[PDB]
Amino acid sequence: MQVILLDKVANLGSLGDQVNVKAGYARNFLVPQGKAVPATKKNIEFFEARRAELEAKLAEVLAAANARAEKINALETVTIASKAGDEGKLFGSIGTRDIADAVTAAGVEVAKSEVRLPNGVLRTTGEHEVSFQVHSEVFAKVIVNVVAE
Amino acid sequence: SRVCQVTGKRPVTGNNRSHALNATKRRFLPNLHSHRFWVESEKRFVTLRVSAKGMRVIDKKGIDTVLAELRARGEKY
RNA sequence: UAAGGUGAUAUGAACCGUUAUAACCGGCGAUUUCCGAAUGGGGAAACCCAGUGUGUUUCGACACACUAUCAUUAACUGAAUCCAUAGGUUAAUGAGGCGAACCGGGGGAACUGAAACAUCUAAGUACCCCGAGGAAAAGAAAUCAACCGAGAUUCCCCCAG
RNA sequence: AGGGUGACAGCCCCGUACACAAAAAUGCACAUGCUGUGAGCUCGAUGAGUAGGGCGGGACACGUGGUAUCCUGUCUGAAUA
RNA sequence: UUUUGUAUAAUGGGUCAGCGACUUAUAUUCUGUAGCAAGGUUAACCGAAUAGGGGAGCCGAAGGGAAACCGAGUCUUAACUGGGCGUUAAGUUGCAGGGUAUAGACCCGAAACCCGGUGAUCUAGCCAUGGGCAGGUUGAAGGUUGGGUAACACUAACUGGAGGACCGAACCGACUAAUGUUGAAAAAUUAGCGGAUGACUUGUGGCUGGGGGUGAAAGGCCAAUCAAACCGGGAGAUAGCU
RNA sequence: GUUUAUUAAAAACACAGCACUGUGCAAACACGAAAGUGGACGUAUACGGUGUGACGCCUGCCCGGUGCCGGAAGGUUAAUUGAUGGGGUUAGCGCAAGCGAAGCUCUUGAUCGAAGCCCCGGUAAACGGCGGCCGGUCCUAAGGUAGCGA
RNA sequence: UGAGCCUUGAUGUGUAGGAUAGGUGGGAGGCUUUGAAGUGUGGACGCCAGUCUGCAUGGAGCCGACCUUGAAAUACCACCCUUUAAUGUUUGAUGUUCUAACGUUGACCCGUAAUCCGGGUUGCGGACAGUGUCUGGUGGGUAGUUUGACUGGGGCGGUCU
RNA sequence: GCUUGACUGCGAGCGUGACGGCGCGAGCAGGUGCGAAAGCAGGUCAUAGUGAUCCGGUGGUUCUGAAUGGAAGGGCCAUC
């Protein structure tokens, strides 16, 4: 499936390129998010005019964390914080993601999400990561300098 | 019923033919899958029971054109 | 149109009429209980039980009208959920059912024949199902022909067992 | 023509040939209205998950054979005067 | 009628009356007859319609060869003195008839196969909700007065009232015999017989449907029908048989 | 207790008990083109299937065959894929028998390719089997033990 | 962990020799301060002669017609043939991770005074499971059938040209 | 001893079969072997040693070749 990239993707291209992406990836990830759009001739003929707004305004305001899946883990952000927690094992606490941050205030601004709500878990025997999470148990349990720092 | 809402593919009757050319009636069913398509014109997920060929048709045409055809045909989605 | 009539069994009674509302015939109207697609809800068909709105009343109760489902359009309304959407209420329009054959489509046997029998036949027949019309279907060549030409579909006769 | 009349009726009766008839409703033709559908010439354009293909079936008189053409359940998939 | 053979003790018929079985359509071959004759004849269709038009076609006057092809000849063969098949026989179109072919094909007659519906008012199982079981026996557990151990074991009386317990009516069944067998009755009567508080029985309603159900299992039962119900259809199935 | 309503009531069926086996729950299994439903509003002390059939003594030996179960070096093996070869067509060259690029095309079928089968082990309250010979020995998977017996 | 491939880095011992000559053009000097030549040395290769490579310091020079040689310079440039290193890169494979397809007969919210269904939030699984087409095996669970004749009845035996 | 007549096309005329077929055959054309020659030779003293049709494989044959030229396929001949 040929698609033109509206934003930067990891290993496909950057800011406009007819990339041959697998149909499942395009259908389920790139187009449902604001990453790409298929090139059915007319679409690129509109893209060649849209590039003035896209490559400058949208590019400046948001060019990373297109789906907050891999950019959060790669481009470390929101490391500085003040809330500690209980003993070093985050569980159900959103904490702080916006306030007390400097890098995430200029142009491109990646973001994070919440964690598993309290129904079986508590402040011992495990931990959570301050980042986007779909899995909450098998997900990576790397320290984020927020659980105890 | 096993009907693709994009293409209208139904089950179709034919023959299982043995090596002795024994013909026993059978059905060819389509490759139906219930899929949630992200429609941008309404910022929504629309569920449709679509074959793989119908999914290729959606990928080519655009979900807007396919849904326009569906609502011109009826087909409450 | 009429000198005779009130259907027949089917007599009788009481009447109607005889120059034109007796009767009879044709056109157009009105009435058209209840069940039945039955449609206010239910039900063991022709029954049981209601709601809302007007209008009467002797204060006992009465009469009429509306009140189904679904589809389409609109209007208001509107969750999880901010905008929205699903959804809810209302209003107009339409459908539902029955019917012999013919018609198009979705499914689809077996007996039987083959001197058994399985490919084949029977036969896309019987039968079931959906849908339309007075007809239906098809229809104006991405068709044939043969270096000459024909010129949409449909039907009959040959070609030809 | 036919049918009745106490047996078999052209002239007994009802009819038949033929010539006539509608207050009212309605069909058919012309003429003839209202609304609404839009002729002609010139430029163009001129039907893609489609034709075609692998696999499995089916319809073609044709049972896959050396088997053209047609439909498509599955997987693919052009040119475009 | 059927047979080698029938008075046959082999089949069929109680009698009368009425009905009851070689047909129709289209092809094709032969025979008779009629018309025309190297020609014969139209089909559909038109048509004021059994006329007339319509020769599209069909058969015939030429055969041989697988065929191209040749032609009163041709094929076979390198080629025939040969050999095969033809040249020396009028055909065609109706009408009548005899055969044959497709159709039900002289008539009646299966067991059975398939399709679509009707049936759990009988019965088999289950489900819900009600009901029934005279009377009389035996006398478990347990419990109190005793006999007994340092305390459990334990042995009698009284109490108690268990059990797919016992005898036996209602009720449910059906082991034996007789009767009856064109019955009183398409399964019963009489005399005896099993169970009879349970795995019981019974009323009302409901559910399971035919290659299916249900079955404490007999191929049992599913409306007097069951190794595949009944009704209607394919259907005049097929019948080398009577 | 049940059973062939209507020629068989029994030694037949069922049964409490026992054994094997499957089933981790959206259970196995069953009725169902499916949705769903029972199992079961149960959870291995449960549920299904199969066999035997209170209770007492017991229940011997054989895994060679069929079945099931487990594991595997290797062999063969489908769809799919399509290496190489062969043939038709024609551009051309041919004083010509003939040769013959590219494209399209018919045919062949190198390579990849799972289970299964071949092979190894277990299992008999799985289907089943359970000797001769001469007064030690052949064969087998093992050679009928206990008990009973016209 | 394998292969094709734009392109470029490495591969070219009849021997003549200053010793490691695929080849045709173009040409008489290429590189060296985004560093030459000299040394240790990195794993590659090797015919037992070095080619080409990373880095350390390095700081003004190695490399022709050379005379020979069937061939005259890796002096520059370009297509290209034997061989051989790598990646952007295309699919093959094993593995691990992930989430966004897809599952949930987990929890909570809403439609909604509803163990259905749907939407939503969240968790758990996760490209597995499962479904469509195609395919090998198994498959009396089910179905359709076949299983001869002669014959001193039939069967068993015999026979059949 | 020499040889390939275990030949090719035909075949008057017969015999035996319901038929499908089977069998014997002088003689003609071509070419050949043996014999000086006349002549003999179309397998073996004779009679058993066999399997129709359909489908298909191989060699030959420009007979046909679905617009035309090929080719595929089909026919004819030999044969499995």
Swiss-Prot record, chain A:
Gene Ontology CC: cytoplasm; cytosol; cytosolic large ribosomal subunit
Gene Ontology molecular functions: large ribosomal subunit rRNA binding; structural constituent of ribosome
UniProt modified residues of type N6-acetyllysine: K89
Pfam family membership, one: Ribosomal_L9_N
Domain of life: Bacteria
GO biological process: cytoplasmic translation
Keywords recorded for this protein, A-Z: Acetylation, Ribonucleoprotein, Ribosomal protein, RNA-binding, rRNA-binding
Disulfide linkage: none
PROSITE patterns (alphabetical): RIBOSOMAL_L9 (PS00651)
Residues where N6-succinyllysine is found: K71, K83, K112
The protein's assembly and partners: Part of the 50S ribosomal subunit. In stalled/collided disomes (pairs of ribosomes where the leading ribosome is stalled and a second ribosome has collided with it) bL9 in the collided ribosome contacts bS6 and uL2, while it contacts only helices of the 16S rRNA in the stalled ribosome; the inter-ribosome bridge thus formed is different from that formed between normally translating ribosomes.
Family: Belongs to the bacterial ribosomal protein bL9 family.
Biological role stated in the UniProt entry: One of the primary rRNA binding proteins, it binds very close to the 3' end of the 23S rRNA.
UniProt name for this protein: Large ribosomal subunit protein bL9
Organism annotation: Escherichia coli (strain K12)
Gene name of this polypeptide: rplI
Curated annotation (Swiss-Prot), chain B:
Pfam families xref list: Ribosomal_L28
GO-annotated cellular components: cytoplasm; cytosol; cytosolic large ribosomal subunit
Keywords: Ribonucleoprotein, Ribosomal protein, RNA-binding, rRNA-binding
Protein's GO biological process: cytoplasmic translation; ribosomal large subunit assembly
Gene3D superfamilies (alphabetical): Ribosomal protein L28/L24
MF (Gene Ontology): rRNA binding; structural constituent of ribosome
Tree of life domain: Bacteria
InterPro entries: Ribosomal_bL28, Ribosomal_bL28/bL31-like_sf, Ribosomal_bL28_bact-type, Ribosomal_bL28_sf
HAMAP family, sorted: Ribosomal_bL28 (MF_00373)
Subunit architecture: Part of the 50S ribosomal subunit.
Similarity comment: family membership: Belongs to the bacterial ribosomal protein bL28 family.
The name this protein goes by in its record: Large ribosomal subunit protein bL28
Organism in which the protein naturally occurs: Escherichia coli (strain K12)
Record gene name: rpmB
